[PDB]
Structures are given as C-alpha cells and as structure tokens.
Design an enzyme around this catalytic site. Structure first.
Site, PDB file in Angstrom:
ATOM      1  N   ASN B 149       0.843  -1.204   0.000  1.00 29.23           N
ATOM      2  CA  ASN B 149       0.000   0.000   0.000  1.00 29.23           C
ATOM      3  C   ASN B 149       0.875   1.250   0.000  1.00 29.23           C
ATOM      4  OD1 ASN B 149      -3.097   0.884   0.454  1.00 29.23           O
ATOM      5  ND2 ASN B 149      -1.826   2.149   1.826  1.00 29.23           N
ATOM      6  N   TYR B 153       0.584  10.165   4.569  1.00 26.09           N
ATOM      7  CA  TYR B 153       0.271  10.405   5.952  1.00 26.09           C
ATOM      8  C   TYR B 153       1.263  11.455   6.482  1.00 26.09           C
ATOM      9  CZ  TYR B 153      -1.429   5.740   4.744  1.00 26.09           C
ATOM     10  OH  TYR B 153      -2.040   4.660   4.119  1.00 26.09           O
ATOM     11  N   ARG B 154       0.726  12.514   7.018  1.00 25.34           N
ATOM     12  CA  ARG B 154       1.518  13.560   7.584  1.00 25.34           C
ATOM     13  C   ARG B 154       2.413  13.065   8.746  1.00 25.34           C
ATOM     14  NH1 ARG B 154      -3.147  17.258  10.441  1.00 25.34           N
ATOM     15  NH2 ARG B 154      -2.718  16.590  12.615  1.00 25.34           N
ATOM     16  N   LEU B 168      -4.776   7.873   9.663  1.00 27.41           N
ATOM     17  CA  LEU B 168      -6.083   7.703  10.299  1.00 27.41           C
ATOM     18  C   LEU B 168      -6.436   6.228  10.196  1.00 27.41           C
ATOM     19  CD1 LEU B 168      -7.701  10.922   8.873  1.00 27.41           C
ATOM     20  CD2 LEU B 168      -6.563  10.629  11.080  1.00 27.41           C
ATOM     21  N   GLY B 172      -4.712   2.118   4.629  1.00 25.66           N
ATOM     22  CA  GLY B 172      -3.984   0.891   4.345  1.00 25.66           C
ATOM     23  C   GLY B 172      -2.862   0.708   5.323  1.00 25.66           C
ATOM     24  N   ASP B 264      -5.125  22.021   9.375  1.00 21.44           N
ATOM     25  CA  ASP B 264      -5.747  21.033   8.526  1.00 21.44           C
ATOM     26  C   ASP B 264      -6.347  21.665   7.285  1.00 21.44           C
ATOM     27  OD1 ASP B 264      -6.373  18.442   8.614  1.00 21.44           O
ATOM     28  OD2 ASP B 264      -8.352  18.680   9.646  1.00 21.44           O
TER      29      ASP B 264
HETATM   30  C1  LIG Z   1      -2.471  14.264  -0.736  1.00 25.52           C
HETATM   31  C2  LIG Z   1      -2.521  14.269   0.755  1.00 25.52           C
HETATM   32  C3  LIG Z   1      -3.356  13.325   1.350  1.00 25.52           C
HETATM   33  C4  LIG Z   1      -3.448  13.239   2.715  1.00 25.52           C
HETATM   34  C5  LIG Z   1      -2.730  14.126   3.483  1.00 25.52           C
HETATM   35  C6  LIG Z   1      -1.898  15.095   2.918  1.00 25.52           C
HETATM   36  C7  LIG Z   1      -1.781  15.164   1.525  1.00 25.52           C
HETATM   37  C8  LIG Z   1      -0.877  16.155   0.848  1.00 25.52           C
HETATM   38  C9  LIG Z   1      -1.169  16.008   3.885  1.00 25.52           C
HETATM   39  C10 LIG Z   1      -0.052  15.344   4.690  1.00 25.52           C
HETATM   40  C11 LIG Z   1      -0.633  17.311   3.329  1.00 25.52           C
HETATM   41  C12 LIG Z   1      -2.293  16.446   4.787  1.00 25.52           C
HETATM   42  C13 LIG Z   1      -2.982  15.342   5.620  1.00 25.52           C
HETATM   43  S1  LIG Z   1      -4.562  15.853   6.028  1.00 25.52           S
HETATM   44  O1  LIG Z   1      -5.265  16.250   4.756  1.00 25.52           O
HETATM   45  O2  LIG Z   1      -5.198  14.757   6.808  1.00 25.52           O
HETATM   46  O3  LIG Z   1      -4.591  17.067   6.935  1.00 25.52           O
HETATM   47  N1  LIG Z   1      -2.762  14.046   4.896  1.00 25.52           N
HETATM   48  C14 LIG Z   1      -3.251  12.802   5.435  1.00 25.52           C
HETATM   49  C15 LIG Z   1      -4.030  11.946   4.653  1.00 25.52           C
HETATM   50  N2  LIG Z   1      -4.547  10.796   5.144  1.00 25.52           N
HETATM   51  C16 LIG Z   1      -4.236  10.457   6.426  1.00 25.52           C
HETATM   52  O4  LIG Z   1      -4.690   9.309   6.973  1.00 25.52           O
HETATM   53  N3  LIG Z   1      -3.467  11.234   7.207  1.00 25.52           N
HETATM   54  C17 LIG Z   1      -2.959  12.398   6.748  1.00 25.52           C
HETATM   55  O5  LIG Z   1      -2.253  13.092   7.550  1.00 25.52           O
HETATM   56  N4  LIG Z   1      -4.336  12.339   3.339  1.00 25.52           N
HETATM   57  C18 LIG Z   1      -5.126  11.410   2.508  1.00 25.52           C
HETATM   58  C19 LIG Z   1      -4.553  10.060   2.194  1.00 25.52           C
HETATM   59  O6  LIG Z   1      -3.156  10.142   1.928  1.00 25.52           O
HETATM   60  C20 LIG Z   1      -5.323   9.500   0.992  1.00 25.52           C
HETATM   61  O7  LIG Z   1      -6.639   9.286   1.427  1.00 25.52           O
HETATM   62  C21 LIG Z   1      -4.847   8.127   0.564  1.00 25.52           C
HETATM   63  O8  LIG Z   1      -5.553   7.750  -0.615  1.00 25.52           O
HETATM   64  C22 LIG Z   1      -5.048   7.040   1.641  1.00 25.52           C
HETATM   65  O9  LIG Z   1      -4.516   5.862   1.034  1.00 25.52           O
HETATM   66  P1  LIG Z   1      -4.833   4.445   1.637  1.00 25.52           P
HETATM   67  O10 LIG Z   1      -4.429   4.465   3.072  1.00 25.52           O
HETATM   68  O11 LIG Z   1      -6.336   4.448   1.385  1.00 25.52           O
HETATM   69  O12 LIG Z   1      -4.082   3.419   0.795  1.00 25.52           O
HETATM   70 MN   LIG Z   2      -4.461   1.841  -0.625  1.00 22.18          MN
HETATM   71 NA    NA Z   3      -3.432   5.107  -1.068  1.00 23.35          NA
END
Ligand SMILES: Cc1cc2c3c(c1C)C(C)(C)C[C@@H](S(=O)(=O)O)N3c1c([nH]c(=O)[nH]c1=O)N2C[C@H](O)[C@H](O)[C@H](O)COP(=O)(O)O
Ligand SMILES: [Mn+2]
Ligand code: NA
Ligand SMILES: Cc1cc2c3c(c1C)C(C)(C)C[C@@H](S(=O)(=O)O)N3c1c([nH]c(=O)[nH]c1=O)N2C[C@H](O)[C@H](O)[C@H](O)COP(=O)(O)O
Ligand SMILES: [Mn+2]
Ligand code: NA
Lengths: 465, 465
Positions: B149, B153-154, B168, B172, B264
């Site tokens: 996966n 994740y921040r 969160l 995955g 956020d």
């Molecule tokens: C593009 C992006 C996405 C994400 C995030 C961020 C970015 C730039 C950052 C780090 C800037 C911001 C945070 S936030 O939007 O939650 O404030 N971040 C983030 C987070 N998903 C998550 O669980 N924690 C996170 O910390 N998300 C969403 C996550 O990565 C996304 O939902 C993935 O598709 C999850 O993948 P899987 O775990 O489903 O495989």
């Molecule tokens: Mn995934």
């Molecule tokens: Na993903």
C-alpha cells in the site's frame, strides 16, 4: 436439452407433481385448489380434466423454493447465490440457436380460425373481470437495438382473438412499443407470446437482467447451453422451440381497452385502467399441448415464492457493494418488495443509516421498499422472533427510526398520500455504540457452537417430530 | 520512463514552473508564498535557496488542474474521466519492475548518522507544533497479503531520527500495522517513505483504489508501463527507483507520541492526539536531491485541487450506477468532501431522494458528505449562480429538505454534536412534478443553442478581455 415436459417428468419421479383427474373448473376452482396446495408446501399440479376443455392445465409449477432451484438444474436453493455472482459480470453473451422447425408449430390456426376460448384460461378471483393469461412470455423487439426482451405481463381475454397487454411502463415490452410508436407512426407492432417454455427460459424472463440484454442469453447461462428457438410464422421474433402454445400477432397503434379489475399480488383488486390491445393472428401449439397458468393474490402465492428465490440471487450483488451485509431478506408477507430486513456486521456509529440508504438507492428493484429494518448479525433475518426481539430490545423508537418524505412509490400503492409519492421508514435496530447512547448496553446471550453442533448431530436420532 | 525531474523540465518548458533564488525560510515563509501563488492559479515553485539548507524545496506541484492532468501524461482535465472508466474494471493487474540499483540510493546515511534536521522540512502555520513532512509516500505490507500500500500520511518531526506516523484508522498503512501487531506481538513493523517519486506514482498513491490492490499497479495503468522500483536496504519493501529521498525504518510496537496541533485542510487546527512513532534507520537520496513538500489549510490548497481533479475520476463510476446523473461536484470550499452538488435528468416524482441516498451510500469517499444539493440538468453544478438560483426558485424549504439524524461523521468534525455521529441534509432543488406540487410550475428560460455556438465562434475576435 430439457424442455418443460422433461421437467414435469423429473418432478413426477420425485413426488413433486400430482395429476388431478377429477373435473375442475378453470373458473375459480383451480385457484382455490392451488392456493391450499401452495400454502401447505405441496406439489405442482396438472389438471388433466378441466371442465369444458381438452387441454390440461398446469399450475403451482414454482410453488416451492426447491422446484425453483430444480428449474435451473440445481439441487437446492443456496445454488442461487452462485447465479447472483454470475449476474454481477453482466453489469460474448451467448445468442439463441435457431432450429429449422419446432414442436410448438405442430398445430397452427390463423386468421378467423383463431379462438382463444378453446384454451382453458383461468379466472382467479370472484370479482376479476374476465379470464386472464398469467404465464405468457411476451417477446418483443424495439426499433433501436436487436435484443429480444421477455417479460410476463398479464393478459385479459376480451374476444376470440384479442387480449389486453398489461405491461407496466418501465418494462422492456412497454418501452419497445413506446419507441416503435415514435419511430414508425401508425405501423403495427409485432409481438409474440410463448406459454410453457422450458423452466430456464421462464425463470430467465422473470429475472431482472438489464434492458440491454436478452433474457434468452441469461437462460442460456442458467441452462449451460444456448436457448433453442424458432422463428415465428408472421414476424421476425423467435420463440422457444419446446413451447406448448405460442400466440403471434400485433398491437394496433392507439387501440386500447379498459383492463380489470383484477386481484393482485398485494391481496387487493386493482381498479380499471387502460392498456394496449394485442390482436392474435396465429396460435401455434404442440400435439397434446399443456396450458401453463398461475394466479396472484394475497401472499404467499407462486410469484412470491419465485420472488424469494430470486432474492437469493441479489444477496451476492448487494454483498459485493456492501460487504458488511450478512443477510438480506424480503418477506413474502410484505408483498414481496415492500419490506426488507438486513443484517450487518456493524463497524461504526451510524452504520445502519448508510445501509438503509444503500437498499433504497443501489438496485432499482428495491427503490419502492417502504420499510427497512437493520439488525446485527446475531439475528436471523428470516425469523420474526429474532427481528421483533431486536426491534424491541435495541431501539428507542424516536431516536432510531428514520423517516423520509416525498420519495418514489408504486403508483398502485393506494396507501401513499398521493399517487407515485410517499414516505419511507427505516428502523435502526442495531446495537448502539458509545456516542449513539450513553447507557450501558446489554450483553446478549450467545449459544455455545459446540453444543449447537452436537445437537445437530443427534437431532434426527432424538426423533422429537 | 519519466521520473519527477523529467516532469519538472516539461513544466519549465511550458511556463508552469518558477525557480525562486531569493532566500526563503521553510519556517512559515514558503507556505505564504505558495498560498498566494495557488490562489492566483500560478506555477509550481522550486525554492533553490531555502534559508539554512542546501536541498531545494519543491511545492505547489499540483496546484492547478492542468498540472494534475499533465502528471498522468494527459493534455487536460477531461481525460480523467477515461481513467475513471478504467478504475471501474478493478471493481492480470501489473506488478512492479524491480531494478538492481537506483538513483534514490546514490547517497546513504544510517544509524547514528541519520539526521532529519538536514532536510528543509516545512512548518506551515504559526501554531503548528513542529516541522511536518507532507508529501511522503508511505509504503507498507500487511501480514496476510503481499499487496504494497502507498498512502500520504503527515509526519511530525520529533527527533534526529523519529517521526510520528499520522495515519487515520481506515488507511492501508494503519490496518497493516494493526494486523502486524495481532499476528506478531512485539515485533518491529518495517516501513518506508518515498519523497519525490514520479507523478504517476504520487497520484496513484492518493487515488482511492481498493485495499486489495497495490497503488503501484494503478500508477502503472496511468503511466502505460510498469512502475520502476528498488528493494529497500533494510527491509523487503520496494520504493520508486527515481525517488529523490527515501526514509527507511520501523515502528516499535507501543511507541506513540502526542501529535500536533497542526492546521488542517478544514482551515482549523487539529487538537493533540496520539499516533505511532516511526524510527528512521536509513535515509537514501539522489545526488542533488530535491525536497517535495506541501501544506494544507483553509481551502483552496494543493490537496483540494488534487481532490477536484480526482472527483472527475469518480463521475463515470457514479454514472455507471446512476445513469440519470449528468454531473457531480464537490466544491473545494466545502473542505473537498462535505458538500456535493449533483445534477440529474429527473424521470419521476421523488427521484432526487434516491440520488441523495445513492451519494450517501454508494462510495465510501462520500459517506461523510453532510450536504447534498440535487438539481436538474439545466444547472451547472460548478457555478453558484445556477445552484443558488435553483435552490431559491425550485424549493419550499420545509417540503424539499431531507434531514437524517445519527449518521456517520468524521470524528474530527467538531461541529457534530457527538464525536463520530451527526446529521445530514439533502436539498431537493429539482423541478417539482404533479404530485410533488399542485401549482403551475414555471417554464424556465432556455438559451438558443445556435446563438450560443455563434457567439462561441466569434468570442475571441470580439476581444472583450
Ligand atoms: C495528498 C494528501 C493526502 C493526505 C494528506 C496530505 C496530503 C498532501 C497532507 C499530509 C498534506 C495532509 C494530511 S490531512 O489532509 O489529513 O490534513 N494528509 C493525510 C491523509 N490521510 C491520512 O490518513 N493522514 C494524513 O495526515 N491524506 C489522505 C490520504 O493520503 C489519501 O486518502 C490516501 O488515498 C489514503 O490511502 P490508503 O491508506 O487508502 O491506501
Ligand atoms: Mn491503498
Ligand atoms: Na493510497
Ligand atoms: C412472474 C410474474 C411476473 C409478473 C406478473 C405475473 C407473474 C406470474 C402475473 C401475470 C401472474 C401477475 C402480474 S402482477 O404481479 O403485476 O399482478 N404480472 C405482471 C408483471 N409485470 C408487469 O408489468 N405486468 C404484470 O401484469 N410481473 C413482473 C414482470 O413479468 C417481471 O418484472 C419481469 O422481469 C419484467 O421483465 P422486463 O419487462 O423487465 O424485461
Ligand atoms: Mn428485460
Ligand atoms: Na424480463
């Protein structure tokens, strides 16, 4: 390749078909007998001596789940799930195999010799308007695609050669006619109706496959082999080769007649309404033809038993989309579609509401479901003892009941405040998690699976019944 | 095979990338600049002179829809629909192509030499707790399947070699860790994080593909070719070969730290909460490595622009299931997921309610959508002028507003009355049919399509702007 007669023979060998030699009127009497039979889980019925006719009358064919399964070449009812997994992929689909000649064209009558009165058409209930054809596979083509639709539309007798074609407006047949009218003003719409085809074709007709797909193709998958058909004499439609009787004809554009009243699957009479007239130009049959009929009324009836078996087909399609769903059941008592019980493995607060919305939105066959009860997986959705228990121990009615107003409802449902529009109710009868309640929720009694299995093992030997 | 540098070159050639040579602090200043830039639709930004560091900082990479499309080898934004049609089939999925060595392992530091302070990690907002890694592709395996996966994740900086891993609980990565813990008590969970991979891998990571499928496989489909990877030095995970920086390490079971507060995507600070600690044992990078970062805050921000482009991907999947849906839009202003506008070709009374329930139930990404506005197809869902017009001319608020209580809500949404549980509102702003109203409904003004097309033709020549 098993036709209907081969199926009747299989049933007879297994004590699942009774031949009645006493005289019985197709006017009311057959229905009374079939109703008592179906209500006691009895066999299918072949009335060899219908009063006033020579052609035997077959009914209660699918009056038990077993016989529905047998009708798709399966042992029992839980093989229907596998057919659901198949019906998923259809959201090279095998064509028909056209024979040169066929048993269903052994005897032919046309034009002025057509007389539907020679057939033992049944009158089901005392205030029904006229005899009614109930197991006809109506075959239609539209002008835009080649797909041949098969549907079961009730057909009232109004003359030597005239039937009313009661397709509701969302049906394949009705949409085909409507499009034909727009695309060819004033031109006759050819139609054909097959009675007593092989069980796979019959079941294929009733299964809600998408409008894009011929019900013949699905019957092929159920059967294992292409559906054997024959070209009709007076049009380019194909009907099953093994059919007992075939009616061919057309709909004259603008010709309509008052239909009904007729008793329905809801247990009430439908009021009179207008539908197209089907003019019969040919009737073709086998030597020694058998007339296949049924009735609808207060449930349970044969259609409702069909509808419970076909719900097993949908469970997998629902589970693909909502893997939290353990079971999904539409009680025949709820008029087959008006009430659903769904059991889930709940994973978060408010989960039940997502599942209710899913039932009301995911598949069209459940769009008009007025009541949805959601429960946990320690409930058997098929047992009112568990469902009422869950309702009365896991709900506060005002907190856990969802009401939605002004949603689509069947226009024949007279209980809604306005035709075509009414409300829906969901009952969240799941265990409530922190957040949903501030109380200490009860710990339910679970059985010991070892004791259950041990008692399963000695059950027959104990011999209590 | 285009790595990230090749993409930056393509952007520079097209006036879509600006190199900043002035000194700029990664503490607050970069975010301010990127925010003004993104808000004016400007280019991506490469800060060649971050105060106190030698490694350039790249941000606002995907600050425009165009650049998101370009990042999947497409011309513009309406090619994303085709990628949606593809994402449908995945509900032989191509593996990774493993190279023997890779640019991302040109420079290696391990054990005591690991110092995350050498990297220009950004601090985004004045009351954020510490510098924060925001564009890391976290790579994980679970114990039960082989699938790798990728998620974003921040990651808060808490030491020379320690980051907090804020996944969160439905992610995955989080599920993999949770399962690892159950299946191997007390054993370290290997993890790796790639910074600055090729755009297809980055976009693949963020696209919600099912847990069953490696995000690497999807990136392969976007790219046209297998994702080039390399085995990590200290574990069996593979990271992209072209990555600029890779962090390798593990999670010690039970080690957690207070995370945040951090601003956020909702425009508020999240309060402190506990997450696992990621211990970094290796840092590998390219010669002349570039650090890829971003920020979230009040929208719009880069994540939200990403999220609008990825909605175009979902439209086809929604239309497969609800072919009545003409458009479906989640405004960035609604925090990207909290409000949806849906336009339909309404076919029967109460139709809008089926569509609301479908949005709230069909796909999980919309399960927490609190407001859903449904309109007819003469409305452009992307223009508040049309949507407010529809609301204020086609609704009676009490009649046409649906409220559902006690439904699942994001636990961080502080506006719901209880954590994890709140209500939803749907606005039926469709034209009301007979049955839904007894009044004479208004006839809307439709434009002449010939006049529209003619004015399209002379628009540039007219030269009003
Ligand atoms: C593009 C992006 C996405 C994400 C995030 C961020 C970015 C730039 C950052 C780090 C800037 C911001 C945070 S936030 O939007 O939650 O404030 N971040 C983030 C987070 N998903 C998550 O669980 N924690 C996170 O910390 N998300 C969403 C996550 O990565 C996304 O939902 C993935 O598709 C999850 O993948 P899987 O775990 O489903 O495989
Ligand atoms: Mn995934
Ligand atoms: Na993903
Ligand atoms: C099995 C069966 C089914 C049906 C019916 C009947 C039976 C025995 C009879 C004639 C006994 C009773 C009525 S009734 O249940 O509406 O009262 N009948 C029936 C009717 N569908 C329909 O439009 N008109 C009908 O008249 N239905 C349902 C319909 O045939 C079924 O929904 C088909 O799958 C529709 O096929 P398509 O038009 O979607 O291709
Ligand atoms: Mn059909
Ligand atoms: Na049908």
């Amino acid at each position: 390749y098993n036709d209907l007669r081969d199926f009747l023979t299989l049933l007879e060998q297994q004590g699942e078909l009774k031949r009645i030699t006493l005289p019985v009127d197709p006017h009311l009497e057959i229905t009374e007998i079939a109703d008592r039979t179906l209500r006691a889980g009895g066999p299918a019925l072949l009335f060899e001596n219908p009063k006033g006719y020579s052609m035997p009358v077959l009914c209660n064919l699918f009056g038990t789940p077993k016989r529905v399964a047998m009708g798709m070449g399966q042992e029992d009812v839980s093989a229907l799930r596998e057919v659901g997994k198949l019906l998923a992929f259809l959201k090279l689909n095998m064509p028909t195999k056209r024979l040169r000649g066929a048993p269903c064209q052994q005897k032919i009558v046309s034009g002025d010799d057509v007389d539907l009165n020679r057939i033992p058409i049944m009158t089901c209930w005392p205030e029904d308007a006229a005899p009614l054809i109930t197991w006809g596979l109506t075959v239609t083509r539209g002008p835009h695609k080649e797909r041949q639709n098969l549907g079961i539309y009730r057909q009232q007798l109004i003359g030597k050669n005239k039937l009313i074609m009661r397709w509701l407006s969302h049906r394949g047949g009705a949409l085909d006619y409507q499009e034909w009218c727009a695309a060819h003003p004033g031109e006759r719409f050819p139609v054909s109706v097959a009675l007593g085809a092989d069980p796979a074709t019959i079941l294929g007709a009733v299964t809600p496959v998408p409008d894009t797909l011929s019900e013949y193709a699905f019957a092929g998958l159920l059967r294992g082999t292409k559906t054997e058909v024959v070209k009709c004499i007076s049009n380019d439609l194909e009907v099953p080769a093994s059919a007992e009787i075939v009616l061919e004809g057309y709909i004259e554009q603008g010709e309509t007649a008052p239909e009904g009243p007729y008793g329905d699957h809801t247990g009430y009479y439908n009021e009179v309404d207008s539908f197209p007239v089907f003019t019969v130009t040919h009737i073709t049959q086998r030597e020694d033809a058998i007339y296949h009929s049924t009735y609808t009324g207060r449930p349970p009836d044969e259609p409702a038993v069909l509808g419970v078996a076909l719900n097993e087909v949908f469970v997998p399609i629902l589970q693909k989309q909502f893997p939290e769903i353990v079971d999904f059941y539409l009680p025949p008592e709820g008029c087959s579609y008006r009430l659903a019980v769904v059991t889930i493995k709940k994973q978060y607060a408010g989960h039940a509401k997502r599942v209710m919305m899913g039932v009301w939105s995911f598949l069209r066959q459940f769009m008009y479901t007025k009541f949805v009860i959601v429960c946990d997986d320690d409930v058997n959705a098929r047992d009112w003892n568990d469902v009422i228990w869950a309702i009365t121990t896991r709900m506060d009615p005002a907190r856990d009941t969802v009401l939605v107003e002004n949603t689509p409802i069947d226009y024949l449902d007279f209980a809604s405040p306005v035709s075509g529009l009414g409300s829906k109710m969901g009952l969240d009868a799941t265990n409530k998690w922190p957040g949903e309640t501030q109380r200490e929720w009860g710990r339910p009694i679970k059985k010991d699976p070892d004791v259950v299995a041990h008692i399963d093992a000695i059950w027959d030997e104990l011999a209590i019944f």
